[PDB]
Symmetry: C6
Subunit: 221 residues, 6 copies
């Protein structure tokens, strides 16, 4: 139990405020295809849903003796190790939010009549639009809105391409539990940063495979 | 024998109470296909069966000089090293239970008439249902039961999708024997955590390949 | 916050002057193909465009404890780690320029009537032509010009092959964000040197796959 | 020669009693197919035969400076390093027996009329049957026997599936010679534990590919 | 700048005399195929040509902290790290010659009428023929000559096979630039030894794929 | 030159007597196929021939700082590092013999009328037959002979399978030159032990692919 108290101290000394969302598989699936519902309000079409968030403190690291002090985030994009205490057993797929850290992302879409009507889901917890434009130039604020993490564009932008740069909250999902037998005892987790899991809606939809942008993207895979 | 006494001390100093189940290949196999019987009470269709459990003490580690102090659980999901003493030779496929550690899991199923009748096998040693729902909302306790590690749902949930989150006992199966010539002498084992071996019954059955959920799962493979 | 002040000092002690360009996906894409416009002035056909540059100071390294002091540039051609402070969140795809460092490159093209008319895009920030020739010998200065980072040749060089050696500004694009939770706080970036991303226009165009030079190139891939 | 005397001391200090069998390729091969004879008494159908055993002392390790003190048995299932002195040159394929170490194994077979008549070869040096059963339950001792390392079942078990758990002598075969120029001088060998080479006879024979059990086996490959 | 002066001292302390040839892509390419001209005097058919050599001093290493003191030449045949000072920016594909080091090579060819007439290009900077023969025995000096790094054989050797062993100057080509931002400032280069890039002309030509010798070659690939 | 004198001392201190054979590609090749002549006396059908042997002293190691003190022979079967001094440049494919070290090997063949007549080439420098037999038992000495490293069997063994165990001289061939610029200066070589290159003649010949023995061989590949 001397190793436990050291770990609790580490969490307290180096931990940052996070939110924890308990995950489950969303039961909206289409029995015929196995696919989530496109516009499911629980999972937004991704097939994993979450229970209400709860606060905790979590130390996040990318290097430790267990990795030979190598940076696991360099070895594998978007990987980190989290250590936390919580009243409940943390599970695979659960999601952690670091409210005070804003991360960037860029995305681009062909705006059809459906996208005008239903809006374009962004999937992230969008906090700011840092840039937005079409081929015609800057999209002014009166011509769009962000609601329920969806981009709603003015109908004049039908059949245009919209490009977007955002700030969103830093989030991770649990890929694994570590040291499951060692040791509110500490729980140690392998984390995956959200931007390495989330796939933007496709550039253009086919009624047949959807069309992705034909652009060399240097973002690490 | 000085290396032996050090190892016995380690087991005693750092070992936790576990149960050991001697494994054998289940003889329920269908001679025509080589597949276990779906609802075999010995192996539950997985083709490996176990003799009655026996208690011991086992030190469990994910790092040692033999791994360069690298975390083998990070290198390979669900891998650990166990060290124990026992009157009998421990073998590949044998199963260890850590009664005092509860692990999580999530699973999802399309509930057909067969599943109502026979129940849905969960495979784990289920200790608690932390969440259960269909597309219609929460499944109340009077509408289900867990018996012999199977989910029995009320017949009104036929043709629904049920999603489930559980707590189960931590268990490992032996993938290998290590240091077989060195050294109740210590036995050293490569372990595989259960959740990395167990495959849930498929989302939906075809009368043809079964249909799995079309969901990106971040659980480490 | 003691780790933060050390990092700020490192940037200040070892940082060099750089320019930062905020990147976004260029909305010139052809809705039918997903390809950028060949001669788009924003992205030059590469599908990523940039906002006006801003100055900062960035420490650039190829070795650190996080890599076991291994040279990541040897492990992976054109990879480096950058550390900088900036008022805005740096993102994937953003581009850094090191104005005071000139890098080399060589390229070769079959000069058709289109290339005479529109010029040949070089993609780099070209600062000098160190060598230029055809099969007929040296191309004298009155017979070419570099405008908007394009090679414009005199029309007599139609149906010739031109070879070119240049100096260009050293530039990187961001492939990843590192230590996203640690810590104008320092921002730590995985960088990709430009010459490992940029693809020269093809040797010869087909009206069908374009024809690349059939030459064994020792440049690291 | 100072490195030699150190090595001889190591063998003497840390060596255990082993038997050595000189191996050769068995000349029972069918000229038409290149396959050994199924029931060859020399090689039992495996195509390698052995001369009479001779005693020696061999130090067996899974970690050394030559492996960076990494456990080669974890890196590669069933691998070890042996060091011994012997009057003859030890070769690839030769087999070492550690009489005082018993190892486990499990196997399963469909019992046809041939298997009743000829018995089922187990391939290992079987010392004990720890468990034996069919779908009908425990096979009592009067209903079987182990002779010449074959399982002979009572004819009533025709068309049954028999499952078996055993103890056998620990054995290795030489995969390589190491330090062939350094240095009865010490001989250093890369060893392969028997259970990682031996393939049990197939579950069921086809008159066409034989049918193996359709069971997920966690034994390391 | 204290790291710079250390690097300059290393070059001076451990550097050897080398020649540097600035490389460019040869514009002899056939527009139809993308292949260099077989007997181009600039590139000899390899598609890379060089400007006149210039002398410098270069430290050459196969081990450094950046490789964990591992021998990169063992990790990857023909790889080394060069450090040098020069008035011009050294580029990918440029070639370094170490005049005072002679390296070996062996090659073999079927001598057709073309090869008698045009000679057989050897590609290396040939300094000596250490052995030369056909199936008929030793080729005496009056029956051959080396001119412009080509083997010219007496016409009596038409339809013979000639085998050749040579000494040539040690040469490298630049595969990469390292530490491009650090720091006549030092330039640090990843080098590729010539014999790992140069491909001998084929054993026999087909008018269809050319025929290479069907011989197991232990030269590292 | 202080690093040179240390290396010369190492060779002298730790070197063993070896023979060196200068290698060249054998010009017996069939112009039509590119294959050596089956019974060429120079290369025995392997396509590499050797000039008369010369004595030297060579230090042979499987571990050095350049390998992180890892055993390259474990990393890659039959690999070693040799260091020697010689008046001539040692080359790829050249062969080293360690006369005072005898190595083992086993081989097996179907004896047709050709093999009786021409003998079976063993390829190694055979020093002793430790075991020889057919399906009929031991082959007595009056019924065979080893001449020019070929097995000549009495004609009564036509249409038999012969199995053979031998002792042969330890030999290596050069796969690479290391430290080509550093530094009778020392020459440092990557070596490949002969038994990892030599392929025995096939079990049985087809007039179509030859038939190899269908036996699981544990010799490291
Ligand atoms: Zn849903
Ligand atoms: Zn069963
Ligand atoms: Zn554009
Ligand atoms: Zn046999
Ligand atoms: Zn040319
Ligand atoms: Zn020959």
């Amino acid at each position: 139990e001397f190793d436990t108290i050291d770990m609790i101290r580490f969490i307290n000394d180096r931990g940052i405020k996070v939110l924890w969302e308990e995950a489950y598989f969303c039961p909206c699936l289409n029995p015929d295809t196995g696919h989530p519902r496109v516009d499911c309000p629980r999972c937004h079409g991704k097939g994993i849903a979450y229970l209400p968030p709860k606060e905790t403190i979590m130390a996040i690291q990318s290097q430790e003796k267990g990795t030979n002090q190598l940076d696991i985030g360099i070895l594998d994009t978007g990987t980190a190790i989290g250590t936390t205490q919580l009243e409940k057993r943390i599970s695979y797929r659960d999601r952690f939010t670091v409210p005070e850290v804003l991360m960037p992302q860029q995305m681009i879409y062909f705006v059809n009549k459906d996208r005008i009507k239903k809006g374009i889901p962004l999937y992230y917890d969008v906090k700011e639009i840092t840039y937005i434009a079409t081929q015609d130039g800057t999209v002014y604020e009166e011509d769009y809105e962000i609601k329920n993490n969806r981009l709603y564009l003015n109908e004049k932008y039908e059949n245009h391409t919209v490009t977007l740069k955002i700030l969103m909250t830093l989030r991770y999902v649990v890929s694994d539990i570590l040291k499951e037998s060692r040791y509110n005892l500490p729980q140690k987790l392998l984390l995956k940063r959200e931007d390495v899991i989330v796939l933007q809606d496709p550039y253009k939809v086919n009624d047949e495979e959807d069309l992705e942008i034909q652009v060399d993207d240097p973002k690490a895979s």
